Symmetry: D2
Subunit: 230 residues, 4 copies
């Protein structure tokens, strides 16, 4: 028995261009970022990949990538399920700030720790901060104390896992063809469990943008292999 | 006084509307004009400050792409979209794919007129060997084959829509969710027939414009208080 | 590719003994009625029938039948989905009345028509009547205009079939082993569709109490055969 | 705004009479444990407690509690949602062994540590052991990695919290009346989060069997107060 799982990281956003920390900030794809999702959709169509369900975040840049893939591949009827659990890693009080001004405010050494470490997060938001996800209507049905004030990669890995165990994985076991269209850090959390990686290994893992990552899994969901369609 | 707001929206022009070809369940895309109409609907809904908790649509791309363009322009991409065959356009049977001169040649122009304007007289049936039968399309692989039409009249479309109203749309409205239904002329006519308790005569005369939001204000029992177009 | 579907009719209610028209009246199984479901479970256990989902009505005489089956087969973990659409045919203003009282106030032959006919329903309740389902909190999430003042067998067939098409049949097509536990007329509606019966045929059909009705279906859900486990 | 949540721990299982470690072993309620469930049902009905949903585990001692309550309260129409996440704390290789026997092998103080600590689990099951939930068809839809070889209370707490955030809390915020009918340790997991308890507080917390525990919560689901119905 072989199941097939496809992971896809969204392309460039407008804030990647302006050199700002994004996190849960809901910024759009750039034109190039849209172009990547379309190209990803071609490669999947060219290899005749089909899907019974698409999982993505509640952030437009991921959602739009999912949409462009399904449109390009002629699979618009496929249900799309959107969850905050697949959101990008939250960047705390860094969200919105220029990456350079931060590197001269806190120093480049401290800023590097917050980006590259596994378990040391950036400084928290207060709940009175306008960037606190609890103020955003997008999250009105979610209990507000489930929402982060800040995240390290470990936090992201821990919030993605219940969604893997409760929705994605059961669908795979039911013989559904799943695509996960999400963000680097949330996808790294999925990959960490899939291949049972150490902290060192997940930190060295870089998932390229707009390139479908295909996992073949056995009856127990142990990876038989993985590869990129490029 | 408890009031609820429901928004209905018919998709814009498809590629086959130009060619004057009967579409039905054929999954033809919106033309560029159909794209822009969905955007314009979205722009206007954003301007009048409309918000949605759920969008219901068909499994046909011209309707789905309309929902998408509205959510995107209105900055509501996080909103769930639920897609169902029960909101599909009326099935046109053996007319699907053919233009008016082809159908006149096969059936005579007078038979075709009856099928266009009737309530309960459907056009000729497809059978299981015809490649246009929804049963051969993998889009419907999880739908029981005998739920899928070989042909439909408006009465059929009306009857298959009603269950989805009672099971999914109406309960959402009663839970104070702000619903948009983005669909097709005939499936929307099926919802309106029930809402306003229209006779067969009145539903036949009803002509819902394309790409114009149709707003229904409903009371606590979902009886309409009023309806109007945003245009 | 063959699928297996089980149908089961609940045992004797307390009102069957009293000889009153039941309908949607939510009367319990008699003790005998509980024994019938327990025996039904034993039969299914003996032939090692497993279930992934049980569908039933929102009426206790059917819910409790399902419970007793799952309990006897040691399958309590299996999800039970309850719906108004699988309810018994509504008996209108006859609900709660004696079968002799109805003969008196309506005539004996008029009553037989209401029971045996396909499309002639008994007299309507009005909105002011206490027995109208709209006053019952059980149906508080159901829009009130979807609920009947009375029903003929045609009505029952037409409310059951959307639930067959939307929920039961798609489960079967997902290779889930389904049991439907319900009522005479709601089951007769399902059978009518399964076997594409005429009106005359469905009116002659007599589904016995507490005996599992097994359908073998092909890949398109067309019945290959059916039989009773006894 | 405020909300009302009801918790209930199941009564005595047959293995409690034998002083045996149960964990995920799916043993039935004792007759006393059935009566407790029925008595709980009478109390709730008397005080006019209604429910829109009942959450329970996939273990029959909890499921049968939920059923006996609904039956006595005359609320059989209410959906029951069963989840492994609400299962009892897993007892590793101790499952099936009696408490006197276990003292001789490991020593009584070491057994106390496994019974009473927060973060030290009993000896873990082998993957090849018959008792590993991964061999149980009840969990065929759950990825094997989610299935424990052993648990400390900390593990149980961490597996219950996602179900709180994903299912229970959104229902409460959607104005649904929820009952959770489960196990001592899984309920302690919920209470730990609800009352923001320290590790020390939750270890001393002792929830009696078969007594409904009512929580009153504010608009952000923070408890205003809680009490037992006795």
């Amino acid at each position: 028995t072989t199941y097939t799982l496809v992971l896809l990281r969204h392309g460039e956003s407008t804030w990647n261009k302006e050199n700002k920390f994004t996190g849960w900030t809901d910024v759009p794809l750039s034109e190039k970022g849209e172009e990547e999702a379309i190209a990803a959709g071609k490669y999947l169509k060219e290899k005749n990949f089909k899907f019974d369900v698409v999982y993505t975040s509640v952030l437009k840049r991921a959602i739009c990538t999912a949409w462009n893939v399904l449109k390009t591949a002629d699979l618009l009827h496929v249900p799309v399920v959107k969850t905050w659990r697949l959101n990008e890693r939250h960047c705390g009080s860094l969200q919105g700030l220029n990456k350079s001004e931060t590197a001269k405010k806190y120093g480049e050494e401290q800023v590097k720790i917050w980006r590259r470490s596994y378990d040391i997060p950036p400084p928290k938001l207060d709940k009175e901060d306008n960037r606190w996800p609890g103020h955003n209507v997008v999250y009105k049905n979610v209990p507000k104390d489930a929402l982060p004030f800040t995240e390290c990669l470990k936090d992201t890995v821990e919030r993605v896992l219940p969604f893997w165990f409760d929705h994605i994985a059961p669908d795979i076991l039911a013989n559904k063809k799943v695509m996960v269209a999400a963000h680097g850090n949330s996808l790294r959390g999925l990959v960490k469990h899939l291949d049972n990686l150490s902290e060192a290994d997940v930190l060295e893992l870089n998932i390229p943008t707009g390139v479908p990552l295909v996992y073949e899994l056995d009856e127990n969901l142990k990876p038989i292999k993985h590869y990129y369609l490029l």
